[PDB]
Design an enzyme around this catalytic site. Structure first.
Site, mmCIF file in Angstrom:
data_model
loop_
_atom_site.group_PDB
_atom_site.id
_atom_site.type_symbol
_atom_site.label_atom_id
_atom_site.label_comp_id
_atom_site.label_asym_id
_atom_site.label_seq_id
_atom_site.Cartn_x
_atom_site.Cartn_y
_atom_site.Cartn_z
ATOM 1 N N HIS A 77 -33.422 -45.900 3.666
ATOM 2 C CA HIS A 77 -32.095 -45.633 4.203
ATOM 3 C C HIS A 77 -31.209 -45.302 3.011
ATOM 4 C CE1 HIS A 77 -28.896 -46.010 7.212
ATOM 5 N NE2 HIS A 77 -28.231 -46.794 6.384
ATOM 6 N N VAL A 118 -27.833 -58.437 2.550
ATOM 7 C CA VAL A 118 -29.273 -58.672 2.459
ATOM 8 C C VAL A 118 -29.594 -60.107 2.855
ATOM 9 C CG1 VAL A 118 -31.228 -58.819 0.891
ATOM 10 C CG2 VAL A 118 -29.688 -56.879 0.760
ATOM 11 N N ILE A 126 -28.900 -60.136 7.121
ATOM 12 C CA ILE A 126 -29.556 -59.247 8.065
ATOM 13 C C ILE A 126 -31.051 -59.265 7.755
ATOM 14 C CG2 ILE A 126 -29.674 -56.905 8.994
ATOM 15 C CD1 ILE A 126 -26.799 -56.528 8.222
ATOM 16 N N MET A 148 -32.831 -55.928 6.381
ATOM 17 C CA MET A 148 -32.380 -55.395 5.109
ATOM 18 C C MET A 148 -33.170 -56.064 4.000
ATOM 19 S SD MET A 148 -28.414 -55.187 4.393
ATOM 20 C CE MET A 148 -27.800 -53.972 3.246
ATOM 21 N N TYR A 199 -30.454 -53.164 11.798
ATOM 22 C CA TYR A 199 -29.416 -53.382 10.796
ATOM 23 C C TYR A 199 -28.105 -52.744 11.227
ATOM 24 C CZ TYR A 199 -27.079 -51.097 6.760
ATOM 25 O OH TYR A 199 -26.168 -50.523 5.906
ATOM 26 N N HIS A 218 -26.487 -55.001 13.902
ATOM 27 C CA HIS A 218 -26.311 -56.403 13.566
ATOM 28 C C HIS A 218 -24.823 -56.699 13.399
ATOM 29 C CE1 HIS A 218 -26.368 -60.190 11.419
ATOM 30 N NE2 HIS A 218 -27.646 -60.315 11.733
HETATM 31 C C1 LIG Z 1 -22.462 -48.554 -3.115
HETATM 32 C C2 LIG Z 1 -21.642 -48.183 -1.882
HETATM 33 C C3 LIG Z 1 -22.032 -48.980 -0.636
HETATM 34 C C4 LIG Z 1 -21.936 -48.104 0.609
HETATM 35 C C5 LIG Z 1 -21.864 -48.877 1.924
HETATM 36 C C6 LIG Z 1 -21.675 -47.912 3.095
HETATM 37 C C7 LIG Z 1 -21.587 -48.646 4.434
HETATM 38 C C8 LIG Z 1 -21.772 -47.708 5.621
HETATM 39 C C9 LIG Z 1 -21.788 -48.432 6.977
HETATM 40 C C10 LIG Z 1 -22.159 -47.404 8.048
HETATM 41 C C11 LIG Z 1 -21.157 -46.815 8.815
HETATM 42 C C12 LIG Z 1 -21.474 -45.864 9.778
HETATM 43 O O1 LIG Z 1 -20.473 -45.276 10.569
HETATM 44 C C13 LIG Z 1 -22.791 -45.488 9.969
HETATM 45 C C14 LIG Z 1 -23.787 -46.064 9.206
HETATM 46 O O2 LIG Z 1 -25.126 -45.695 9.385
HETATM 47 C C15 LIG Z 1 -23.485 -47.007 8.245
HETATM 48 C C16 LIG Z 1 -24.688 -47.561 7.483
HETATM 49 O O3 LIG Z 1 -25.769 -46.919 7.528
HETATM 50 O O4 LIG Z 1 -24.638 -48.648 6.857
#
Ligand SMILES: CCCCCCCCCc1cc(O)cc(O)c1C(=O)O
Ligand SMILES: CCCCCCCCCc1cc(O)cc(O)c1C(=O)O
Lengths: 104, 104
Positions: B8, B34, B37, B40, B75, B78
């Site tokens: 992912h 981590v 969940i 993860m 995930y 969750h």
């Molecule tokens: C080092 C930077 C950390 C980045 C964290 C990004 C969190 C994204 C959460 C999310 C929102 C969304 O609308 C759709 C999704 O798939 C996801 C995801 O995959 O976590």
């Protein structure tokens, strides 16, 4: 650990009319660059299966491991890398390029 | 080993107003997931250093290993992931998500 590495990540969308056969030739020639450009230490790639950003249309991801940003530069300006673009730039609609050190 | 896991990959650009300290807090509280969940397994992240994407200026990259697309979806829904995404969504300007099995 003892070794240092920088990851070169490319995200790619092919033009809509490009065939699977053409994509296969493109990818075979790209991953073969490891036999030409010594800076390239590892190459792993994959095709997205979930289509979470279908509208943007990126489908392919390649991760290339390098020793440093300096050897990444050697790869970028290598004649075989320039030549790969010469022959295959017309295959892609758009790209994203990243260079980063993965950490926890 | 012979395993067939799925990666992912998240690519992100924060809004311009977000401070470096705020970005770090976001990353720290993302990595804490981590511990919460089950699906993860691990997290690696990095900041791009070459800034090559012009108007598509993503800055941050996170890679998370999962058993399968189905457990990625575990995930996603969750409540600790929903809660994280809900409350930080106003932080980011651009977000791309990819799920793929790396191969040679
Ligand atoms: C080092 C930077 C950390 C980045 C964290 C990004 C969190 C994204 C959460 C999310 C929102 C969304 O609308 C759709 C999704 O798939 C996801 C995801 O995959 O976590
Ligand atoms: C499994 C998919 C293989 C995709 C290979 C994409 C090659 C892109 C070449 C390139 C073009 C460019 O205009 C700028 C660049 O930085 C680069 C690069 O990083 O290689």
């Amino acid at each position: 650990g003892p070794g240092m590495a920088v990851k070169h990540l490319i995200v790619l969308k092919f033009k809509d009319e490009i065939t699977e056969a053409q994509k296969e030739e493109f990818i075979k020639t790209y991953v073969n660059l490891v036999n030409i450009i010594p800076a390239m230490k590892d190459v792993y790639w994959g095709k997205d299966v979930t289509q979470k950003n279908k509208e943007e249309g990126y489908t392919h991801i390649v991760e290339v491991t390098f020793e440093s940003v300096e050897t990444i530069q050697d790869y970028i300006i290598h004649p075989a890398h320039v030549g790969f673009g010469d022959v295959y730039r017309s295959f892609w609609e758009k790209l994203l390029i990243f260079d980063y050190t993965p950490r926890k």
